[PDB]
Amino acid sequence: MAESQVERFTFQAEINQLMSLIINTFYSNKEVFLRELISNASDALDKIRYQSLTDASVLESKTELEIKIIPDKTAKTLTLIDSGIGMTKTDMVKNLGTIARSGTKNFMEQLQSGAADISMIGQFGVGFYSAYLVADTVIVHSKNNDDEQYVWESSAGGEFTIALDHTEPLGRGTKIVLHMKEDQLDYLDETKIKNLVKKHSEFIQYPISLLTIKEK
């Protein structure tokens, strides 16, 4: 018998509206989600790398600076792991949905006016929410040197939860798990995801491993 305390939070109103706009509108090309996942991993890796220049001890929790991308058709998941800075519990509450910058309202306005298309979401400071183009549920496991490992989860609908994480220890970094929508399962096809990772990583300075999971 296991026990966990789970904390439930409400999304900021504009973030809720944005998630609704991302989920309930048709977009012909959703590949930006993968660009944004990889972008966030790279930024997290840069942050810990630069921290290490001024204090080498920050890397002791995990010496490797790398990205792993794991399509799993059986599980209907795409997982992206980085060994970057990671997020504390408070970092996840603040960065993943309780605070909204002015980018949110302006992005929704520009989507509706035609000034911006969905592929431009990262420029408005809300790139993370692009995951909901292709995923019904997003799970973010993260470990920062300053906290225990936590897991954030949301299926949208106005709420997210955060709990102490009892799954595989990361050492340091973030493991984002996208539970893919049925009509978006093609993004788990090995050749398709391999080639898109190539397309969306030309400028990425960290090693990327693609690990395709086959069941039995």
Ligand X SMILES: Nc1ncnc2c1ncn2[C@@H]1O[C@H](COP(=O)(O)OP(=O)(O)NP(=O)(O)O)[C@@H](O)[C@H]1O
Residue 24 counted as an annotated binding residue: no
Residue 16 counted as an annotated binding residue: no
33: contact with ligand X by CB under 6 A: no
Tell me phi and psi for residue 145, to 5 degrees: -55, -30
The residues facing 7 across adjacent strands are 162
126: contact with ligand X by CB under 6 A: yes
Residue 95 counted as an annotated binding residue: yes
Contact 127, 40 (CB under 8 A): yes
Q: Contact with ligand X (CB under 6 A): which of 18, 44, 93, 135? A: 44
Q: Contact with ligand X (CB under 6 A): which of 16, 18, 19, 36? A: 36
Contact 47, 84 (CB under 8 A): yes
Contact 85, 51 (CB under 8 A): yes
Instruction: Give the nearest distance from C-beta 29 to Mg ion in angstroms.
Output: 18
Structure tokens at 90: 């408070």
Tell me the C-alpha distance between 141 and 170, whole Å.
Answer: 8
Task: Using the minimum distance from each CB to ligand X, give the nearer residue, 85 or 180.
Answer: 85
**Which residues, numbered 27-56, are part of the site for Mg ion (CB under 5 A)?**
39-40
188: contact with ligand X by CB under 6 A: no
Residue 107 counted as an annotated binding residue: no
**Helices of type H across the chain:** 13-23, 32-54, 89-93, 103-113, 190-199
Instruction: Give the nearest distance from C-beta 39 to ligand X in angstroms.
Output: 6
User: Which residues of this chain interact with ligand X, rule CB under 6 A?
Assistant: 36, 40-41, 43-44, 82, 84-85, 87, 95-96, 125-128, 174
